[model samples]
Target: GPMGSNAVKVRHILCEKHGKIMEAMEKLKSGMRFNEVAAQYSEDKARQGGDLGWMTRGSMVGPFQEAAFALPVSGMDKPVFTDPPVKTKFGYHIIMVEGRK
Candidate 1:
Protein backbone atom coordinates (compact mmCIF):
# COMPACT_ATOMS: atom_id res chain seq x y z
CA GLY A 1 0.00 0.00 0.00
CA PRO A 2 1.16 3.56 -0.74
CA MET A 3 0.07 7.06 0.27
CA GLY A 4 -1.95 8.23 -2.73
CA SER A 5 -3.11 11.45 -1.07
CA ASN A 6 0.40 12.84 -1.34
CA ALA A 7 1.20 13.43 -4.95
CA VAL A 8 4.76 12.23 -5.47
CA LYS A 9 6.10 14.43 -8.23
CA VAL A 10 9.16 13.16 -10.05
CA ARG A 11 10.83 12.74 -13.46
CA HIS A 12 13.30 10.26 -15.00
CA ILE A 13 16.35 10.95 -17.13
CA LEU A 14 17.56 8.50 -19.76
CA CYS A 15 20.28 8.95 -22.35
CA GLU A 16 21.04 8.07 -25.93
CA LYS A 17 24.29 9.99 -25.80
CA HIS A 18 25.62 7.69 -23.10
CA GLY A 19 27.47 10.14 -20.78
CA LYS A 20 25.41 13.24 -21.30
CA ILE A 21 23.04 12.49 -18.45
CA MET A 22 23.95 15.85 -16.94
CA GLU A 23 22.69 17.61 -20.05
CA ALA A 24 19.34 15.85 -19.66
CA MET A 25 19.10 17.09 -16.11
CA GLU A 26 19.68 20.66 -17.26
CA LYS A 27 16.88 20.34 -19.78
CA LEU A 28 14.44 18.98 -17.20
CA LYS A 29 15.37 21.69 -14.73
CA SER A 30 14.29 24.25 -17.30
CA GLY A 31 10.79 22.67 -17.53
CA MET A 32 11.53 20.25 -20.36
CA ARG A 33 9.18 17.30 -20.86
CA PHE A 34 10.70 14.07 -19.61
CA ASN A 35 8.87 11.92 -22.17
CA GLU A 36 9.67 14.20 -25.05
CA VAL A 37 13.29 14.33 -24.07
CA ALA A 38 13.48 10.59 -23.67
CA ALA A 39 11.80 9.98 -27.01
CA GLN A 40 14.26 12.20 -28.81
CA TYR A 41 17.28 11.22 -26.78
CA SER A 42 17.07 7.91 -24.99
CA GLU A 43 18.91 4.97 -26.51
CA ASP A 44 16.52 2.37 -25.09
CA LYS A 45 13.10 1.53 -26.54
CA ALA A 46 11.40 2.52 -23.30
CA ARG A 47 12.45 6.04 -24.27
CA GLN A 48 8.99 6.61 -25.74
CA GLY A 49 8.54 8.52 -22.54
CA GLY A 50 9.77 8.60 -18.96
CA ASP A 51 7.04 6.29 -17.83
CA LEU A 52 7.95 4.51 -14.58
CA GLY A 53 4.36 3.76 -13.72
CA TRP A 54 3.22 3.96 -10.09
CA MET A 55 6.34 3.48 -8.03
CA THR A 56 5.89 3.76 -4.29
CA ARG A 57 9.12 4.13 -2.36
CA GLY A 58 10.70 0.67 -2.30
CA SER A 59 8.96 -0.18 -5.51
CA MET A 60 11.82 1.53 -7.39
CA VAL A 61 15.56 0.97 -7.12
CA GLY A 62 17.51 2.35 -4.17
CA PRO A 63 19.11 5.52 -5.67
CA PHE A 64 16.00 6.56 -7.56
CA GLN A 65 13.68 5.90 -4.64
CA GLU A 66 16.01 7.75 -2.33
CA ALA A 67 16.05 10.91 -4.43
CA ALA A 68 12.30 10.74 -5.11
CA PHE A 69 11.38 10.57 -1.43
CA ALA A 70 13.68 13.47 -0.64
CA LEU A 71 11.56 15.95 -2.58
CA PRO A 72 10.40 18.92 -0.50
CA VAL A 73 6.64 19.36 -0.12
CA SER A 74 6.94 23.11 0.30
CA GLY A 75 5.77 25.61 -2.32
CA MET A 76 9.25 25.63 -3.77
CA ASP A 77 10.18 22.92 -6.27
CA LYS A 78 12.54 20.27 -4.94
CA PRO A 79 15.03 19.63 -7.71
CA VAL A 80 16.13 15.98 -7.70
CA PHE A 81 18.64 16.34 -10.53
CA THR A 82 21.84 14.78 -9.27
CA ASP A 83 25.35 15.08 -10.69
CA PRO A 84 27.28 12.06 -12.07
CA PRO A 85 23.86 10.64 -12.97
CA VAL A 86 23.77 8.21 -10.02
CA LYS A 87 24.26 4.47 -10.52
CA THR A 88 21.95 1.69 -9.34
CA LYS A 89 22.98 -1.28 -11.53
CA PHE A 90 20.40 0.14 -13.94
CA GLY A 91 22.33 3.02 -15.55
CA TYR A 92 22.48 6.79 -15.12
CA HIS A 93 19.48 8.98 -14.22
CA ILE A 94 18.35 12.44 -13.10
CA ILE A 95 14.88 13.07 -11.69
CA MET A 96 13.26 16.50 -11.39
CA VAL A 97 10.51 16.77 -8.81
CA GLU A 98 8.07 19.37 -10.08
CA GLY A 99 5.19 19.11 -7.61
CA ARG A 100 2.51 16.91 -6.16
CA LYS A 101 -1.26 16.92 -6.38
Candidate 2:
Protein backbone atom coordinates (compact mmCIF):
# COMPACT_ATOMS: atom_id res chain seq x y z
CA GLY A 1 0.00 0.00 0.00
CA PRO A 2 2.96 2.27 -0.29
CA MET A 3 2.72 5.25 -2.63
CA GLY A 4 4.77 8.12 -4.04
CA SER A 5 8.08 7.96 -5.91
CA ASN A 6 9.90 8.08 -2.64
CA ALA A 7 7.96 5.22 -1.07
CA VAL A 8 8.82 1.54 -1.41
CA LYS A 9 8.38 -1.87 0.16
CA VAL A 10 11.57 -3.83 0.61
CA ARG A 11 13.18 -6.86 2.19
CA HIS A 12 16.83 -7.80 2.58
CA ILE A 13 19.30 -10.24 3.99
CA LEU A 14 22.06 -8.38 5.75
CA CYS A 15 25.35 -10.00 6.57
CA GLU A 16 28.61 -8.83 8.03
CA LYS A 17 30.76 -11.00 5.82
CA HIS A 18 30.75 -10.71 2.06
CA GLY A 19 31.25 -14.41 1.47
CA LYS A 20 28.34 -15.31 3.68
CA ILE A 21 26.09 -12.87 1.90
CA MET A 22 27.12 -14.28 -1.45
CA GLU A 23 26.28 -17.76 -0.25
CA ALA A 24 22.88 -16.53 0.86
CA MET A 25 22.26 -15.10 -2.57
CA GLU A 26 23.18 -18.41 -4.11
CA LYS A 27 20.73 -20.16 -1.83
CA LEU A 28 18.03 -17.74 -2.88
CA LYS A 29 18.74 -18.54 -6.50
CA SER A 30 18.62 -22.22 -5.68
CA GLY A 31 14.95 -21.88 -4.70
CA MET A 32 15.44 -21.48 -0.98
CA ARG A 33 12.86 -19.22 0.68
CA PHE A 34 13.86 -15.72 1.71
CA ASN A 35 12.62 -15.94 5.28
CA GLU A 36 14.24 -19.30 5.75
CA VAL A 37 17.55 -18.01 4.49
CA ALA A 38 17.28 -14.86 6.59
CA ALA A 39 16.62 -16.72 9.78
CA GLN A 40 19.62 -18.93 9.28
CA TYR A 41 22.06 -16.40 7.87
CA SER A 42 21.22 -12.75 8.19
CA GLU A 43 22.81 -10.72 10.92
CA ASP A 44 20.05 -8.15 11.00
CA LYS A 45 16.27 -8.19 10.69
CA ALA A 46 16.23 -11.98 10.82
CA ARG A 47 13.14 -12.03 13.04
CA GLN A 48 11.21 -10.23 10.31
CA GLY A 49 13.01 -12.08 7.56
CA GLY A 50 14.72 -8.84 6.69
CA ASP A 51 11.38 -7.24 6.04
CA LEU A 52 11.73 -3.47 5.92
CA GLY A 53 8.10 -2.98 5.02
CA TRP A 54 7.32 0.50 3.67
CA MET A 55 10.06 3.05 3.42
CA THR A 56 10.41 6.58 2.11
CA ARG A 57 13.35 7.81 0.03
CA GLY A 58 15.15 9.72 2.75
CA SER A 59 14.49 7.20 5.48
CA MET A 60 17.58 5.08 4.75
CA VAL A 61 21.28 5.71 4.36
CA GLY A 62 22.84 6.67 1.02
CA PRO A 63 23.82 3.36 -0.55
CA PHE A 64 20.84 1.43 0.79
CA GLN A 65 18.34 4.13 -0.17
CA GLU A 66 19.71 4.24 -3.69
CA ALA A 67 19.67 0.47 -4.18
CA ALA A 68 16.21 0.04 -2.61
CA PHE A 69 14.73 2.70 -4.86
CA ALA A 70 16.67 1.62 -7.93
CA LEU A 71 15.31 -1.92 -7.95
CA PRO A 72 12.52 -2.61 -10.40
CA VAL A 73 9.26 -3.87 -8.96
CA SER A 74 8.47 -6.17 -11.84
CA GLY A 75 10.51 -9.05 -13.32
CA MET A 76 11.12 -10.45 -9.87
CA ASP A 77 9.43 -13.74 -10.70
CA LYS A 78 13.01 -14.82 -10.98
CA PRO A 79 15.89 -14.09 -8.65
CA VAL A 80 17.08 -10.49 -8.77
CA PHE A 81 20.42 -9.34 -7.58
CA THR A 82 21.86 -5.87 -7.00
CA ASP A 83 24.94 -6.94 -8.94
CA PRO A 84 27.51 -6.89 -6.12
CA PRO A 85 24.83 -6.35 -3.53
CA VAL A 86 24.52 -3.08 -1.63
CA LYS A 87 27.19 -1.99 0.81
CA THR A 88 25.94 0.15 3.65
CA LYS A 89 27.41 1.42 6.88
CA PHE A 90 25.89 -1.62 8.49
CA GLY A 91 27.11 -4.29 6.03
CA TYR A 92 26.24 -6.02 2.78
CA HIS A 93 22.61 -6.34 1.72
CA ILE A 94 20.77 -8.45 -0.77
CA ILE A 95 17.88 -6.11 -1.47
CA MET A 96 14.50 -6.96 -2.90
CA VAL A 97 12.07 -4.26 -3.83
CA GLU A 98 8.57 -5.62 -3.54
CA GLY A 99 6.81 -2.48 -4.78
CA ARG A 100 6.80 1.25 -5.09
CA LYS A 101 4.24 4.03 -5.09
Candidate 3:
Protein backbone atom coordinates (compact mmCIF):
# COMPACT_ATOMS: atom_id res chain seq x y z
CA GLY A 1 0.00 0.00 0.00
CA PRO A 2 1.08 3.63 -0.68
CA MET A 3 0.13 7.07 0.47
CA GLY A 4 0.55 10.64 -0.85
CA SER A 5 1.45 11.87 -4.32
CA ASN A 6 4.77 12.11 -6.06
CA ALA A 7 5.95 11.62 -9.61
CA VAL A 8 8.59 9.31 -8.17
CA LYS A 9 10.49 8.34 -5.08
CA VAL A 10 14.21 9.03 -5.40
CA ARG A 11 17.06 6.73 -4.34
CA HIS A 12 20.82 6.91 -4.53
CA ILE A 13 23.41 4.85 -6.35
CA LEU A 14 27.12 4.56 -5.74
CA CYS A 15 27.68 4.16 -9.43
CA GLU A 16 26.51 7.25 -11.25
CA LYS A 17 25.36 7.13 -14.83
CA HIS A 18 22.94 9.47 -16.50
CA GLY A 19 21.27 6.76 -18.53
CA LYS A 20 21.25 4.25 -15.75
CA ILE A 21 19.86 6.79 -13.29
CA MET A 22 16.96 7.66 -15.54
CA GLU A 23 16.28 4.02 -16.24
CA ALA A 24 16.17 3.29 -12.54
CA MET A 25 13.88 6.26 -11.79
CA GLU A 26 11.44 5.29 -14.52
CA LYS A 27 11.35 1.79 -13.13
CA LEU A 28 10.46 3.21 -9.73
CA LYS A 29 7.66 5.31 -11.14
CA SER A 30 6.29 2.31 -12.99
CA GLY A 31 6.35 -0.04 -10.04
CA MET A 32 8.99 -2.57 -11.01
CA ARG A 33 11.26 -4.63 -8.80
CA PHE A 34 14.44 -2.95 -7.56
CA ASN A 35 16.57 -5.60 -5.88
CA GLU A 36 18.94 -6.34 -8.71
CA VAL A 37 19.99 -2.69 -8.98
CA ALA A 38 20.48 -2.59 -5.26
CA ALA A 39 22.65 -5.67 -5.09
CA GLN A 40 24.59 -4.58 -8.10
CA TYR A 41 25.11 -0.86 -7.47
CA SER A 42 24.16 0.39 -4.02
CA GLU A 43 26.77 1.79 -1.65
CA ASP A 44 24.84 0.59 1.38
CA LYS A 45 24.89 -3.08 0.62
CA ALA A 46 24.06 -4.15 4.13
CA ARG A 47 20.73 -2.33 4.07
CA GLN A 48 19.44 -2.80 0.56
CA GLY A 49 21.36 -5.45 -1.21
CA GLY A 50 19.77 -2.65 -3.32
CA ASP A 51 16.03 -3.19 -3.05
CA LEU A 52 13.74 -0.37 -1.85
CA GLY A 53 10.08 -1.05 -1.48
CA TRP A 54 7.03 1.23 -1.90
CA MET A 55 7.35 4.62 -0.24
CA THR A 56 5.30 7.77 0.32
CA ARG A 57 6.22 11.31 -0.66
CA GLY A 58 6.89 12.33 2.93
CA SER A 59 9.34 9.48 3.17
CA MET A 60 11.78 11.81 1.42
CA VAL A 61 12.60 15.47 1.50
CA GLY A 62 11.09 18.02 -0.88
CA PRO A 63 14.48 18.89 -2.38
CA PHE A 64 15.14 15.28 -3.31
CA GLN A 65 11.92 14.78 -5.25
CA GLU A 66 12.44 18.25 -6.66
CA ALA A 67 15.61 17.04 -8.32
CA ALA A 68 14.05 13.68 -9.11
CA PHE A 69 10.89 14.90 -10.79
CA ALA A 70 12.82 17.40 -12.83
CA LEU A 71 14.35 14.41 -14.52
CA PRO A 72 12.86 13.89 -17.95
CA VAL A 73 11.05 10.62 -18.32
CA SER A 74 13.50 9.91 -21.17
CA GLY A 75 16.93 11.06 -22.40
CA MET A 76 20.21 11.86 -20.69
CA ASP A 77 20.90 14.34 -17.93
CA LYS A 78 24.19 15.18 -16.28
CA PRO A 79 25.17 13.12 -13.28
CA VAL A 80 24.08 14.85 -10.06
CA PHE A 81 25.23 13.48 -6.77
CA THR A 82 23.93 14.78 -3.45
CA ASP A 83 26.10 17.22 -1.59
CA PRO A 84 26.46 16.44 2.08
CA PRO A 85 25.47 13.22 0.35
CA VAL A 86 21.66 13.32 0.58
CA LYS A 87 20.94 13.32 4.27
CA THR A 88 17.55 14.30 5.58
CA LYS A 89 15.28 14.09 8.62
CA PHE A 90 14.29 10.63 7.50
CA GLY A 91 17.74 9.05 7.31
CA TYR A 92 20.79 8.72 5.12
CA HIS A 93 19.55 7.79 1.67
CA ILE A 94 21.07 6.21 -1.41
CA ILE A 95 17.95 6.03 -3.53
CA MET A 96 17.54 3.76 -6.49
CA VAL A 97 14.49 3.17 -8.64
CA GLU A 98 13.43 0.09 -6.77
CA GLY A 99 9.83 -0.56 -7.77
CA ARG A 100 6.59 1.03 -8.84
CA LYS A 101 2.97 0.32 -8.07
Candidate 4:
Protein backbone atom coordinates (compact mmCIF):
# COMPACT_ATOMS: atom_id res chain seq x y z
CA GLY A 1 0.00 0.00 0.00
CA PRO A 2 1.16 3.54 -0.82
CA MET A 3 -0.02 7.10 -1.43
CA GLY A 4 0.40 6.56 -5.17
CA SER A 5 1.35 3.29 -6.96
CA ASN A 6 3.93 0.56 -7.03
CA ALA A 7 4.89 -2.47 -9.15
CA VAL A 8 2.90 -5.64 -8.46
CA LYS A 9 3.10 -9.31 -9.25
CA VAL A 10 -0.17 -11.06 -10.11
CA ARG A 11 -1.34 -14.51 -11.10
CA HIS A 12 -4.78 -14.73 -12.72
CA ILE A 13 -7.28 -17.34 -13.81
CA LEU A 14 -8.89 -16.01 -16.97
CA CYS A 15 -12.13 -17.27 -18.38
CA GLU A 16 -14.35 -16.16 -21.25
CA LYS A 17 -17.49 -17.17 -19.39
CA HIS A 18 -18.46 -15.88 -15.96
CA GLY A 19 -20.00 -19.27 -15.27
CA LYS A 20 -16.65 -21.00 -15.02
CA ILE A 21 -14.61 -18.20 -13.51
CA MET A 22 -16.06 -18.42 -10.06
CA GLU A 23 -15.62 -22.16 -10.05
CA ALA A 24 -11.94 -21.52 -10.57
CA MET A 25 -12.00 -19.11 -7.66
CA GLU A 26 -13.75 -21.77 -5.61
CA LYS A 27 -10.89 -24.16 -6.20
CA LEU A 28 -8.49 -21.35 -5.41
CA LYS A 29 -10.07 -20.66 -2.05
CA SER A 30 -10.45 -24.34 -1.11
CA GLY A 31 -6.71 -24.86 -0.91
CA MET A 32 -5.24 -21.83 -2.62
CA ARG A 33 -5.18 -23.78 -5.87
CA PHE A 34 -5.01 -20.97 -8.45
CA ASN A 35 -2.04 -22.29 -10.38
CA GLU A 36 -3.73 -25.63 -10.98
CA VAL A 37 -7.03 -23.99 -11.92
CA ALA A 38 -5.29 -21.79 -14.49
CA ALA A 39 -4.49 -24.91 -16.54
CA GLN A 40 -8.11 -25.15 -17.60
CA TYR A 41 -9.56 -21.62 -17.24
CA SER A 42 -6.88 -19.47 -18.79
CA GLU A 43 -7.76 -18.06 -22.18
CA ASP A 44 -4.52 -16.15 -22.48
CA LYS A 45 -2.36 -18.51 -20.52
CA ALA A 46 0.90 -17.19 -19.02
CA ARG A 47 2.83 -20.43 -18.55
CA GLN A 48 3.75 -22.43 -15.41
CA GLY A 49 2.93 -20.20 -12.45
CA GLY A 50 -0.16 -18.47 -13.98
CA ASP A 51 1.51 -15.19 -13.04
CA LEU A 52 1.63 -11.92 -14.91
CA GLY A 53 4.79 -11.54 -12.85
CA TRP A 54 5.52 -7.85 -12.12
CA MET A 55 4.36 -4.71 -13.85
CA THR A 56 4.57 -0.95 -13.65
CA ARG A 57 1.48 1.26 -13.66
CA GLY A 58 -0.65 1.20 -16.85
CA SER A 59 0.76 -2.18 -17.82
CA MET A 60 -2.61 -3.92 -17.31
CA VAL A 61 -6.32 -3.29 -17.77
CA GLY A 62 -8.33 -0.90 -15.58
CA PRO A 63 -10.34 -3.23 -13.36
CA PHE A 64 -7.62 -5.85 -13.49
CA GLN A 65 -4.94 -3.45 -12.30
CA GLU A 66 -7.32 -2.01 -9.77
CA ALA A 67 -7.55 -5.36 -7.97
CA ALA A 68 -3.83 -5.98 -8.34
CA PHE A 69 -2.94 -2.98 -6.21
CA ALA A 70 -5.73 -3.41 -3.71
CA LEU A 71 -4.66 -6.78 -2.27
CA PRO A 72 -1.55 -7.13 -0.18
CA VAL A 73 0.96 -9.65 -1.47
CA SER A 74 1.08 -12.89 0.49
CA GLY A 75 3.50 -15.78 0.74
CA MET A 76 3.83 -19.26 -0.84
CA ASP A 77 1.96 -20.76 2.11
CA LYS A 78 -1.09 -18.62 1.31
CA PRO A 79 -1.12 -16.35 -1.73
CA VAL A 80 -3.64 -13.52 -1.35
CA PHE A 81 -6.76 -13.48 -3.51
CA THR A 82 -8.91 -10.58 -4.78
CA ASP A 83 -12.01 -12.36 -3.33
CA PRO A 84 -14.10 -10.48 -5.90
CA PRO A 85 -13.23 -11.19 -9.51
CA VAL A 86 -12.49 -8.52 -12.16
CA LYS A 87 -13.66 -8.48 -15.76
CA THR A 88 -12.10 -6.69 -18.71
CA LYS A 89 -12.78 -6.89 -22.45
CA PHE A 90 -10.72 -10.05 -22.52
CA GLY A 91 -12.49 -12.05 -19.79
CA TYR A 92 -13.38 -12.52 -16.15
CA HIS A 93 -10.28 -12.94 -14.03
CA ILE A 94 -9.45 -14.26 -10.57
CA ILE A 95 -6.30 -12.51 -9.46
CA MET A 96 -3.72 -13.82 -7.02
CA VAL A 97 -1.80 -10.97 -5.43
CA GLU A 98 1.68 -12.41 -5.44
CA GLY A 99 4.10 -9.58 -4.59
CA ARG A 100 4.73 -5.84 -4.63
CA LYS A 101 7.69 -3.54 -5.05
RMSD for each of the candidates: 4.7, 3.3, 9.3, 2.7
After superposition, candidate 2 runs with Cα above 4 Å error: 1-5, 74-79
> Per TM-score, what order, best first?
4, 2, 1, 3
Computed on alpha carbons, the lDDT of every model, listed in order, comes to: 0.57, 0.79, 0.44, 0.78
TM-score of each: 0.58, 0.83, 0.34, 0.84
Alpha carbon lDDT at 32, candidate 2: 82
Q: After superposition, which runs of candidate 3 have C-alpha atoms over 4 Å from their true positions? A: 1-3, 7-10, 14-49, 73-101
The residue-by-residue lDDT of candidate 3 on 9-40, one tens digit each, is: 34454344444445544544455444444454
Q: Estimate, for each residue in 9-85, the C-alpha lDDT of model 4 and write its tens digit.
A: 88888888988888888777777566777876776664665777887777889899888888888864677777777
Top candidate by lDDT:
2
Cα distance off (Å), candidate 2, residue 12 = 0.4
Two-way TM-score contest, 1 vs 4, winner: 4
Model 2: weakest 10-residue lDDT segment is 74-83
Model 4 lDDT, residue 28, Cα: 76
Position 82, candidate 1: lDDT: 51
Runs in model 4 with CA error above 4 Å? 1-5
Name the lDDT of candidate 4: 0.78
- Residue 55's lDDT in candidate 4: 79
